[PDB]
Design a protein around this nucleic acid. Structure first.
Ligand SMILES: [Mg+2]
Ligand SMILES: [Mg+2]
Ligand SMILES: [Mg+2]
Ligand SMILES: [Mg+2]
Ligand SMILES: [Mg+2]
Ligand SMILES: [Mg+2]
Ligand SMILES: [Mg+2]
Ligand SMILES: [Mg+2]
Ligand SMILES: [Mg+2]
Ligand SMILES: [Mg+2]
Ligand SMILES: [Mg+2]
Ligand SMILES: [Mg+2]
Ligand SMILES: [Mg+2]
Ligand SMILES: [Mg+2]
Ligand SMILES: [Mg+2]
Ligand SMILES: [Mg+2]
Ligand SMILES: [Mg+2]
Ligand SMILES: [Mg+2]
Ligand code: NA
Ligand code: NA
Lengths: 145, 151, 118, 125, 54, 49, 160
RNA sequence: AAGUUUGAAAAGCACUUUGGAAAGAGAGUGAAAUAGAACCUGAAGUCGUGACAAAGACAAUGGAAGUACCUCCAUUUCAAC
RNA sequence: UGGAAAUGGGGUGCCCCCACCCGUCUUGAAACACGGACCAAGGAGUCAAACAGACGCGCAAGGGAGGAGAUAUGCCA
RNA sequence: GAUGUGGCCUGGAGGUUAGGACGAAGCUUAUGGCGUGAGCCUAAGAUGGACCGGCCUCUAGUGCAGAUCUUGGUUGGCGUA
RNA sequence: AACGUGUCGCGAUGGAUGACUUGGCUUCCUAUUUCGUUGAAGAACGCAGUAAAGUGCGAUAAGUGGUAUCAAUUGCAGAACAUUC
């Protein structure tokens, strides 16, 4: 009934996802692979969407909006890869099934997520050693049940 | 509490007086001359100013005052003998000496290291002028703070 | 409730003495709440209160004055020294204490009967 | 992270355009005000007077808003704000807001170091 | 300049506006909803009073 | 658009050859000197362009 | 209408070396001879004092406001616009969300709470609950101390 | 004219010391006396003081380009780089 | 990988060149034309009514009230 | 003199997003960065003590250098007459 | 060199700013709602253990009586029916 064209006309200047800070217009939409505020990258808006996300461990997850259940927000997004050590091109082809116009950015995002996971491993190990050197007068333990 | 600090606080003595009720400009001149002096040298200078054998050099608050030969030792031509500021500053120096004695310091070795005179809040009186005018008659009191250090 | 902050604050800070008595109430202990089925009660002279908030928190003592003009109660056990070393009572807001033992006059029991929730 | 490389920053003019004769009146701030006095030597553009700002002083589009480090300052307030920077992290750096407290700053700096997101005002090391 | 406008007859010449020297001569309608509610409540009260008469 | 009321009101109505409507709330006002030969003069209906 | 103007306050004229503003009459007082009546004068009258016959209210064409209500309802039928507005609807089953009429038979706030959790409206209610704060600025001195977001709105068939 | 608006409590600075006193120097209270009493914050302007920069008489200020000295500032680099 | 090397910015002095006091009225102001000691806070195109033109919006040979009633409505101007 | 500006700025309102005792507003600056500019933002307070930022829209008693401008304070003349 | 200039650190004077508002202004509503020769409004003078102003009161004078309420008032003093003097 109401197209992505009309919805983009409606939300472009004003939206809870538009972050206009300084003179820069970014997006904190969860389904935006870029953070750029463009109709192409508005995953929350588009009928079909796909976003590359990180998962537990070195895994890479792809979330897909196939447009078949857009009236059902709980069923709107589906997790489809959640695999570890996938080629970035494999993520790119998983994304291109719904949105070929998102292939390049999702490939780059897959590579960036892999880089981030390895970097986080290194930083965490260094921080752990530094911590093992220190007395640490207080330590909080979450209650377990 | 003081705009500066002694280099060594265990070897120093402080003293200040607030809203002194002496003329600020005269007290400025009287207190500034002892700034780097030994305490005994300063007390002798004040005693001699009371005897009018030496004078207070007047620098910066000397507009149209008299010239005197006693200003030559200070490299000036203009000086005065402001007994009220002098006696107030003698009292202040006595207080500083007492503070030094309490601390177990020898007043014969103390050197005045810091002297600051500031304009305090003014008190208002009035004066009566020709043609039914009322025009201000203000008093200009001062704050003085000093400390001295053992040589 | 009271749509006006100005009027509510004026009615509080300009309150009469009996209204201030009501405003200066403290909760009962778990045991007293069980015994009387009353949650809170206006503080009275010769009540026993333990402090729950502030620097004197945990201190138990007996109420010696409900000042009501300073919005404080005075407890015999909570106090400090002046410069000359004599003792002075320290006022506490009753909403920071808990009544552990009530002073019971006949009218006090009547009030507790009126407030019984069962 | 290394910023993307741009050409040399030119910065046509580094002096500020300050208000005429503000050095003489303590209450006059240096903030620019266009002189409108009929005899104003600044408005009439006498040779030895202060210059007036105009469009020809505008910076090269390619190097505009780029800080000396080579990033563009993006204000952030949270840990979650870093995620929109995570992808364009060779272009935008994060500026932690002045009012963000020290505790939340500790968390932000830890996460930003992990993400390789440059912070303009993070921890020195 | 005047230009081509209608010739104005706004008739505001008399001291109608309240100010430091004039009481003014004005009638605002700010109590309109409260008076509508009062009229309706009064009609309901009168119907209650005269029941069952119309 | 040529039948529009604004178009009908455009131009001075007191110049020769003009037939624009004046801005007037009262239709009976402005029907005298300047519009009738017997009232000083009448604005000419026609003028050669 | 009398504020700032409650004085005799005549101008002294140009004979004396003072400005021509009206000045308060009399003597023996710190305000004797002070500037008066002027918008630039302390204790004077404000420029163009505010009136009560300012246009506070607006008339809107009936068709335009019906059109506006209709457009707002159609917008609420669009999940993307709903999340763009700021609601947390990522867990709700359907949009537009239609529930059974039996919630009109609830009597305790606890059952209504359970129902809100059941159809996953509790996330938006929680967003509103956590947004509660003291209002910034002078509005808190006025009778407007707290602010919060709007949250879900439950439409009933009638007043019961 | 004029908010008493210290501070959560007055806990409103015992006591020592010198001074005629006002006060000063110490010590105490307090989370904080640059919170010490018509005491929250404490601006501008003006003034004192210490350190420094120098500086003829071109009134001073100002522009533009350098240079000397400083810099509690920013950013970058630190090896097959 | 440091009481650091660079570059940029900031500060003060110096040099060589430049360089009449602002605001204003006026044909013409650096003017021997007038207002001009400093700072703080305050300080001047407003509101209402009638008409027009442009532009936005709805409906259209029709458009639209107003006042007031009705009942959701007894919280809700 | 006219007009434009996803042009700057201020007090409130409807929204939406944040921040704050691990320190809000205010205030200080050889305190840098950004902008042609209105200004914005960071840093540091050896400042402060409790509120408040961004963005869209709404709204107004919304921006000062001068009016022999208003009120308060200060000030050279002056330790002079 | 002495006055005198500049810049920075620290002080003074001075009370702006910000937060705070038992105040103002404006709007709306409810009524067995409208003073006095049965002496009003207003003026004046007094009244507390301690009491200038203000507030309250009137030689019964910071109040008497009554009905509720229930343990104070409070700067000090003084007093000490609680099932309500
Ligand atoms: Mg002479
Ligand atoms: Mg005389
Ligand atoms: Mg006389
Ligand atoms: Mg610049
Ligand atoms: Mg000219
Ligand atoms: Mg008329
Ligand atoms: Mg009058
Ligand atoms: Mg006023
Ligand atoms: Mg002239
Ligand atoms: Mg002429
Ligand atoms: Mg001129
Ligand atoms: Mg001439
Ligand atoms: Mg003239
Ligand atoms: Mg112009
Ligand atoms: Mg306003
Ligand atoms: Mg104004
Ligand atoms: Mg001007
Ligand atoms: Mg009396
Ligand atoms: Na302590
Ligand atoms: Na000003």
């Amino acid at each position: 009934s109401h197209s992505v064209d009309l919805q983009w006309v409606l939300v472009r200047q004003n939206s809870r996802f538009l972050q206009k800070r300084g003179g820069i217009r970014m997006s904190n939409d969860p389904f935006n692979n870029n953070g750029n505020w463009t109709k192409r990258h508005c995953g929350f808006l588009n009928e079909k969407a796909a976003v590359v996300k990180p998962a537990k461990g070195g895994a890479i997850c792809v979330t897909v909006k196939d447009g078949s259940s857009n009236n059902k927000p709980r069923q709107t997004y589906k997790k489809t890869v959640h695999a570890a050590g996938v080629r970035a091109s494999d993520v790119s082809r998983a994304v291109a099934a719904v949105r070929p116009d998102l292939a390049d950015v999702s490939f780059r995002r897959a590579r960036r997520m892999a880089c981030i996971a390895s970097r986080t491993a290194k930083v965490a190990a260094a921080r752990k050693a530094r911590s093992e050197k220190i007395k640490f007068s207080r330590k909080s333990a979450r209650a377990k049940r | 509490h003081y705009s500066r600090k002694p280099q060594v606080s265990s070897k120093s003595a402080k003293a200040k007086v607030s809203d002194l009720r002496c003329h600020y400009k005269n007290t400025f001149e009287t207190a500034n001359v002892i700034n780097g002096m030994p305490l005994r040298k300063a007390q002798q200078l004040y005693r001699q100013v009371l005897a009018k054998t030496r004078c207070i050099p007047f620098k910066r608050y000397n507009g149209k005052i008299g010239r005197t030969a006693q200003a030559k030792e200070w490299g000036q031509t203009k000086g005065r003998w402001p007994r009220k500021s002098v006696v107030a500053m003698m009292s202040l120096l006595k207080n500083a000496e007492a503070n030094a004695i309490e601390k177990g310091l020898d007043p014969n070795q103390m050197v005045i290291k810091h002297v600051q005179v500031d304009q305090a809040a003014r008190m208002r009186r009035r004066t009566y002028r020709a043609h039914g005018r009322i025009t201000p008659y203000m008093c200009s009191p001062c704050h003085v703070q000093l400390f001295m250090s053992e040589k | 409730k009271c749509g006006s902050r100005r009027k509510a604050r004026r009615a509080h800070f300009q309150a009469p003495s009996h209204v201030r008595r009501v405003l200066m109430s403290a909760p009962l202990s778990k045991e007293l709440r069980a015994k009387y089925n009353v949650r809170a009660m206006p503080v009275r002279k010769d009540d026993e209160v333990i402090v729950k908030r502030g620097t004197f928190k945990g201190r138990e003592g007996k109420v010696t004055a409900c000042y009501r003009l300073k919005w404080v109660i005075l407890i015999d056990k909570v106090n400090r020294e002046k410069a000359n070393g004599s003792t002075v009572a320290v006022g506490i807001h009753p909403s920071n204490v808990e009544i552990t033992k009530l002073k019971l006059t006949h009218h006090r029991k009547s009030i507790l009967e009126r407030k019984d929730r069962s | 992270v290394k910023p993307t490389v741009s050409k040399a920053i030119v910065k046509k003019r580094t002096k500020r355009f300050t208000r005429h004769r503000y050095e003489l009146f303590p209450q006059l701030s240096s903030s620019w005000r266009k002189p409108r006095g009929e005899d104003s030597p600044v408005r009439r553009r006498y040779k030895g007077q202060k210059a007036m700002p105009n469009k020809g002083y505008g910076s090269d589009r390619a190097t505009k808003y780029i800080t000396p480090s080579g990033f563009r300052n993006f204000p952030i307030n949270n840990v979650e704000d870093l995620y929109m920077l995570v992808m364009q992290n060779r272009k935008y750096a994060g500026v932690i807001s002045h009012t963000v407290g020290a505790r939340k700053r500790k968390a932000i700096v830890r996460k930003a170091m992990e993400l390789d997101v440059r912070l303009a005002n993070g921890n020195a090391k | 300049p005047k230009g081509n406008n209608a010739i104005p007859h706004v008739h505001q010449k008399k001291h109608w506006n309240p100010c430091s020297s004039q009481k003014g001569n004005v009638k605002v309608f700010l109590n309109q909803p409260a008076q509508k509610h009062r009229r309706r409540r009064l009609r309901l009260l009168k119907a209650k009073k005269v029941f069952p008469r119309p | 658009k040529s039948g529009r009321e604004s178009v009908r009101h455009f131009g001075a109505s007191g110049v020769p050859g003009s037939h624009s409507k004046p801005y007037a709330t009262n239709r009976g006002k402005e029907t005298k000197r300047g519009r009738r030969t017997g009232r000083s003069y009448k604005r000419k209906a026609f003028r050669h362009v | 209408r009398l504020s700032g103007m409650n004085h005799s306050a005549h101008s002294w004229g140009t004979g004396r070396a003072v400005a021509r503003i009206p000045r308060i009459s009399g003597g023996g007082t710190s305000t004797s001879g002070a500037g008066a009546f002027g918008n630039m004068c302390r204790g004077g009258r404000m420029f163009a004092p505010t009136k009560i016959f300012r246009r506070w209210h607006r008339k809107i064409n009936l068709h335009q406001k019906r059109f506006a209500v209709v457009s707002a309802l159609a917008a609420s039928s669009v999940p993307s616009l709903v999340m763009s507005r700021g609601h947390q609807i990522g867990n709700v089953p359907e949009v537009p969300l239609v529930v059974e009429d039996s919630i009109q038979g609830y009597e305790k706030t606890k059952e209504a709470m359970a129902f809100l959790k059941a159809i996953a409206a509790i996330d938006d209610v929680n967003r509103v609950n956590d947004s509660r704060e003291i209002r910034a600025g002078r509005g808190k001195m006025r009778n407007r101390r707290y602010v919060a977001r709007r949250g879900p709105m439950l439409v009933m068939p009638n007043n019961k």
